[PDB]
């Protein structure tokens, strides 16, 4: 009753161009079985949204990667937030929500915006730049480690660590195994910076430790919650901003609309998240036999969600394959949905907004002027190199 497909959603061929295979997965049925990895798959918006919004049946505490923590040992101690279900999830979630809250955004917005403006001015002086290394990477590296309260030394470990985290949600293919083989120095750096003495006053890390006396988290929980921000808080935004610039380079008509109304910057970034979902896939595990879309899935089964596919499903979106900065993006799943929906989304949106605002006000054209190279990761989607010429406004 459930179609079986041989598509490998963690192959380089899939990463190179996932859209035809995603349509194949959507059109095969609401629920598919992926023989390559012995997991169920859901690629339509309706089922992805339903799975995300039933955490009791589709749990996260057995891992949101291929590995089932009930069968195999996690490669690192489980996350107290991502890899937790309610009720254990609830108070750590509440702490990170307050740390990454509107009030915090107000304290950091001016500095984040100045840094975006300054970066665009710098890039305009160079003219020809790599929008990944020089912009998508450089801008978040210029604001987020400092907002965390990290020392300067060792920040070169942050992107490798995140690439490891997101590769480790995949199956035991070469991307994952190579990442784990090389991981020891990055893990050692990250774990050490999670300790309260290594996090500067006023930053996100220190704020997490300052929440350890309310009864929400204990002091021994705070280093792992800092670890969560050092895992998810940088590489995601690198790929999101890279996606937005890639979209504006490929859709010059939308760059021109954005120039004419820079207050579209925040929605232009949100549409980039929908269109080029930086996080493409991850898993849940069933806690019982469950009927989904008309198929019966047994207990203890991994269910792979295709977030990028759900965000391009024509059952939900009009012209899903168009980048439209005035689209009503409400409901996209690029930040997830439900109780685990990205707790850092206000930081992500702030970065993306202020960067796209700076481009809207300062740049007249973005022209690809060199070979574009993709960066392969088991769950993140984005580019390795994006050579562009920036023309000043
Ligand atoms: C464009 C940038 C980003 C994207 C696309 C993104 C995407 C996501 C998604 C899809 C989830 C849901 C995971 C799940 O349901 O299992 C999530 C959760 C999470 N994200 Fe984000 N994220 C971004 C930026 C950030 C930032 C900047 C931070 C921190 C500063 C962050 C921290 C987290 C954390 C801690 C969780 C787990 C929340 C929970 O389990 O309750 N993310 N993110
Ligand atoms: O370490 C964490 O808590 C953490 C790691 C990865 C993520 C993540 C974000 C988006 C998609 C999948 C996973 C969230 C939290
Ligand atoms: Cl670690």
Automatic annotation (TrEMBL):
Keyword Manganese among UniProt keywords: no
Q: Name one GO molecular function term.
A: monooxygenase activity
Which InterPro entries has this protein been placed in?
Answer: Cyt_P450, Cyt_P450_B, Cyt_P450_CS, Cyt_P450_sf
Required co-factors: heme
Q: Which UniProt keywords apply?
A: Heme, Iron, Metal-binding, Monooxygenase, Oxidoreductase
The residues that cross the membrane are none
Q: Which residues form the signal peptide?
A: none
Highest taxon in the source lineage: Bacteria
Where do the annotations place heme b binding? 89, 93, 284, 340, 342
The family assignment reads:
Belongs to the cytochrome P450 family.
Q: Mind telling me what this protein is named? A: Cytochrome P450
């Amino acid at each position: 009753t459930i179609p079986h497909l041989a598509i490998d959603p963690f192959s380089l061929d899939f990463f190179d161009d996932p859209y035809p295979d995603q349509q194949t997965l959507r059109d095969a049925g609401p629920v598919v079985y992926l023989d390559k990895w012995n997991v169920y798959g859901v690629a339509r918006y309706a089922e992805v949204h339903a799975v995300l919004n039933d955490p009791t049946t589709f749990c996260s505490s057995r891992g949101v990667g291929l590995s089932d923590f009930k069968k195999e040992k996690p490669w690192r101690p489980p996350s107290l937030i991502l890899e937790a279900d309610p009720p254990a999830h609830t108070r750590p979630r509440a702490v990170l929500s307050k740390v990454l809250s509107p009030a915090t955004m107000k304290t950091i917005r001016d500095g984040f915006a100045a840094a975006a403006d300054a970066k665009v001015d710098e890039l305009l002086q160079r003219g020809c730049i790599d929008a990944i290394a020089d912009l998508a990477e450089a801008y978040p590296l210029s604001v987020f480690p400092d907002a965390m309260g990290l020392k300067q030394e060792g920040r070169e470990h942050l992107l490798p660590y995140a690439g490891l985290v997101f590769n480790a949600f995949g199956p035991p293919n070469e991307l994952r195994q190579t990442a784990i083989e090389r991981s020891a120095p990055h893990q050692a750096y990250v774990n050490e910076q999670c300790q309260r003495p290594n996090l500067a006053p006023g930053g996100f890390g220190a704020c997490i430790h300052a929440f350890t006396d309310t009864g929400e988290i204990t002091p021994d929980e705070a280093p792992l919650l800092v670890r969560s921000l050092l895992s998810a808080g940088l590489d995601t935004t690198v790929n999101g901003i890279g996606a937005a610039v890639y979209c504006l380079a490929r859709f010059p008509g939308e760059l021109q609309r954005l120039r004419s109304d820079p207050t579209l910057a925040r929605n232009a970034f949100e549409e980039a998240v929908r269109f080029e979902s930086p996080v493409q896939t991850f898993f849940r595990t069933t806690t019982r036999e469950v009927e989904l879309g008309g198929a019966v899935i047994g207990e203890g089964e991994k269910v792979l969600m295709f977030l990028g596919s759900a965000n391009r499903d024509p059952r939900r979106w009009s012209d899903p394959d168009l980048y439209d900065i005035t689209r009503k993006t409400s409901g996209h799943v690029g930040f997830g949905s439900g109780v685990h929906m990205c707790v850092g989304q206000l930081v992500a949106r702030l970065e993306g907004e202020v960067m796209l605002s700076a481009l809207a006000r300062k740049v007249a054209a973005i022209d690809i002027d060199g070979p574009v190279k993709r960066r392969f990761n088991n769950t993140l989607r984005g580019l390795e190199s994006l050579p562009v010429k920036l023309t000043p406004a």
